[PDB]
UniProtKB/Swiss-Prot annotation:
The modification Phosphoserine is found at residue 101. Its cofactor is heme. One of its GO terms (molecular function) is monooxygenase activity. Keywords: Endoplasmic reticulum, Heme, Iron, Lipid metabolism, Membrane, Metal-binding, Microsome, Monooxygenase, NADP, Oxidoreductase, Phosphoprotein. This is Cytochrome P450 2B6.
Length: 465
């Protein structure tokens, strides 16, 4: 047939006057109830196919990966990245780079210090800092952003930064800033009417500016790296890349070397940004609303790890309640209700509809995370959602906060490690508190733009002896 069905569009407004205010996703859900799991929405002049439910998403990224493994455009930032980097690249440029980063993560810490090892130290760093607090009320946004960044700085640069380092705090704010700029009213509108709306200055000019600045730091650092390279003792991800380049220069067709080192790197920071920090931020609001969940976790830790030695990844298996409490957190948080845009690469038949080469496509993962067929009463927080009768860990087809298929999250490994190690280590050492009663805690996500973001909150961490 043709493009899946959906609301009657206007000429260059598409379906935009029909949306909700300001529950965009909430709009998408109203269309769902009218059109099914496979509708088309005209976001401005552009046609975008939406897909809901596990079956649909899976049919597309897994069953039909030949077609649906494209990355869709993101106007606010494509003028900078220009197609470079794992999250942004398509075709051969991506296939070549995805592979390299994959093998590099796989073999990292083979020679040098392991990712776990890095997370553990950041963790211990974190706790001292949290203790230095002396049980004071704080907003932890800053720190969580810090620790997550640090882990990627550790991987890529071979080092972490002191939480007070100003060179650091500046760089950080530059990211956060760039993000909320794309999250804004404008960045939204820029993504639509960029065709004409790029001439004028906007937040897009500012965003390039901010990305350019950060990029200066990466180029500088790559140089410092070329000047201290030991071919037989790679310290970091940079060191590994630069080496790949040389062995690569002795080929004939280095698709790899024709690529912008800096951007690739920046893009990796971008990807991992605002990622875990948000989840963790959400995590501890939840532990304030459900303290009895917090206490149980602690007890498991005390039971399995005890009060002194640093939790480690191996503990995971033996701690199913915690792995469940973490899973439910991710599920409930719905970081990216809509994934990251895809485009289809070949013309394709999907549920007897005909989708054209180059159509943008959204996998609405919120709908998988909230499938009442897999999660009883899905709008509430419940770890049990990942436990059986026994209380053994219960994994499901539906928990795909990381998407599925070829483009599936590059940092899942890393991500899951962070969440565990940070979550347990904090909790090993501190109980939580807040001026606000559990039953007064508002969980309502901000849903500002394309991400879900928890409301802001005061928290204090409390030591145990
Ligand atoms: C809780 C944190 C995270 C979540 C929920 C998450 C989820 C996702 C999702 C949904 C995608 C898009 C996949 C798709 O197209 O369906 C993705 C892609 C990606 N993520 Fe994450 N991610 C997280 C953290 C990270 C981190 C820390 C990194 C840093 C290494 C990262 C790096 C990437 C990269 C590089 C891609 C694109 C790779 C590719 O497209 O081939 N993610 N992630
Ligand atoms: C293509 C890069 O997008 C990301 O990496 C995002 C991220 C980064 O994590 C996604 C990578 N796993 N999260 C956030 C917060 C995003 C956002 O737009 O917040 C306003 C998204 C995001 C940022 C910029 C543009 C689009 C999106 Cl979805
Ligand atoms: C492609 C057009 O961009 C938008 O209109 C968006 C919008 C539309 O904003 C409507 C404001 N009236 N917001 C959301 C949620 C976006 C998003 O990516 O969430 C997944 C962004 C968005 C959608 C698709 C691709 C990129 C972005 Cl930034």
């Amino acid at each position: 047939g043709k493009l899946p069905p959906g609301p009657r569009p206007l000429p260059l407004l598409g379906n935009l006057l029909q949306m909700d205010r300001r529950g965009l996703l909430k709009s998408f859900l109203r269309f769902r109830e009218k059109y099914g799991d496979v509708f088309t929405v005209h976001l401005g002049p552009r046609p975008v196919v939406m897909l809901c439910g596990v079956e649909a998403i899976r049919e597309a990224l897994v069953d039909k990966a030949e077609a649906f493994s494209g990355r869709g455009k993101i106007a606010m930032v494509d003028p900078f990245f220009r197609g470079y980097g794992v999250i942004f690249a398509n075709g051969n440029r991506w296939k070549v780079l995805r592979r390299f980063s994959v093998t590099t993560m796989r073999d990292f810490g083979m020679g040098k210090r392991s990712v776990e090892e890095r997370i553990q130290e950041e963790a211990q760093c974190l706790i001292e800092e949290l203790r230095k607090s002396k049980g004071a009320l704080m907003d932890p946004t800053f720190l969580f952003q810090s620790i997550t960044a640090n882990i990627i700085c550790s991987i890529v640069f071979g080092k972490r930064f002191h939480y007070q380092d100003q060179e650091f705090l500046k760089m950080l704010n530059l990211f956060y800033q760039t993000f909320s700029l794309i999250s804004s009213v404008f960045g939204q509108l820029f993504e639509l009417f960029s065709g004409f709306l790029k001439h004028f200055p906007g937040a897009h000019r500012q965003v390039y500016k901010n990305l350019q600045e950060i990029n200066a730091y990466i180029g500088h650092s790559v140089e410092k790296h070329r000047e201290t390279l030991d071919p037989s003792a790679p310290r970091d991800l940079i060191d590994t890349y630069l080496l790949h380049m040389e062995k690569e220069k002795s080929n004939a067709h280095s698709e790899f070397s024709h690529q912008n080192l800096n951007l690739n790197t920046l893009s990796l920071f971008f990807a991992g940004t605002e990622t875990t920090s948000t989840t963790l931020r959400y995590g501890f609001l939840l532990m304030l609303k459900y303290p009895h969940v917090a206490e149980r976790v602690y007890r498991e830790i005390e039971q399995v790890i005890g009060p002194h030695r640093p939790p480690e990844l191996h503990d995971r298996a033996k701690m199913p309640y915690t792995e469940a409490v973490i899973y439910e957190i991710q599920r409930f948080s719905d970081l990216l209700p809509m994934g990251v845009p895809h485009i289809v690469t070949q013309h394709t038949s999907f549920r007897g509809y005909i989708i054209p080469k180059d159509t943008e496509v959204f996998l609405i993962l919120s709908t998988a995370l909230h499938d009442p067929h897999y999660f009883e009463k899905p709008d509430a927080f419940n770890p049990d959602h990942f436990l059986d009768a026994n209380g053994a860990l219960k994994k499901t087809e539906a928990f795909i906060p990381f998407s599925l298929g070829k483009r599936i999250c590059l940092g899942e490994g890393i991500a899951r490690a962070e969440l565990f190690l940070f979550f347990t280590t904090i909790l090993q050492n501190f109980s939580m508190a807040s001026p606000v009663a559990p039953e007064d805690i508002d969980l309502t996500p901000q849903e500002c733009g394309v991400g879900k973001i928890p409301p802001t909150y005061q928290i204090r961490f409390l030591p145990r002896h």
